[PDB]
């Protein structure tokens, strides 16, 4: 509260660490469904169904341009990629399976990097 500050974690490295995580995600072999925004002409339904599109290239742009206030806002956009993927794709599809794999991959890096 006013004049009563909790010690807070050192956030000085967060930009570099998030960039590294993103690089790792961009180079994963299962990243192909997520590298660029979904093309609304090739993909019937995505426009109406997915209210907040997101993809790795949009995250990279936002990260490079100071549009994440903090590391949680970054993680929210990564998770949004995978949540949108699950909304739109059967678990059993190649893209569905890709999204599950990429989510697991991200979350371990997240925990390892910042929960420690």
Ligand X SMILES: Cc1cn(CCn2cnc(-c3ccccc3)c2-c2ccc(C#N)cc2)nn1
Question: Contact residues for ligand X (CB under 6 A)?
Answer: 32-33, 35-36, 38-39, 42-43, 85, 88-89, 95
Structure tokens at 106: 């991200």
Least gap, CB of 81 to ligand X (angstroms)? 8
Instruction: Scan for tokens 């967060």, then name that residue.
Output: 14
Q: Which is nearer to ligand X, 15 or 31 (CB)?
A: 31
Least gap, CB of 89 to ligand X (angstroms)? 6
Distance between CA atoms of 72 and 78, rounded to whole angstroms?
A: 10
Task: Tell me which residue has its CB nearest to ligand X.
Answer: 39
Q: Which is nearer to ligand X, 33 or 110 (CB)?
A: 33
Distance between CA atoms of 28 and 5, rounded to whole angstroms?
A: 40
Please give the helix or strand (H or E) that residue 106 lies within, else none. helix 94-114
Least gap, CB of 109 to ligand X (angstroms)? 20
Q: Which is nearer to ligand X, 89 or 113 (CB)?
A: 89
Q: Report CA Rg, the chain.
A: 16
Q: Which is nearer to ligand X, 13 or 40 (CB)?
A: 40
Least gap, CB of 58 to ligand X (angstroms)? 11
- Kindly compute the dihedral angle of the four CA atoms of residues 25, 53, 18, 113, in this order, to the nearest 10 degrees: -70
């Amino acid at each position: 509260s006013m004049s009563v500050k909790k010690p807070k974690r050192d956030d000085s490295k967060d930009l570099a660490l998030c960039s590294m995580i993103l690089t790792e995600m961009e180079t994963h072999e299962d990243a192909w469904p997520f590298l660029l925004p979904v093309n609304l002409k090739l993909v019937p339904g995505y426009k109406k169904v997915i209210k907040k599109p997101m993809d790795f290239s949009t995250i990279r742009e936002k990260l490079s341009s100071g549009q994440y206030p903090n590391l949680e806002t970054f993680a929210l956009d990564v998770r949004l990629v995978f949540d949108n993927c699950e909304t739109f794709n059967e678990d059993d599809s190649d893209i569905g399976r890709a999204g599950h794999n990429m989510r697991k991959y991200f979350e371990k890096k997240w925990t390892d990097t910042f929960k420690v």
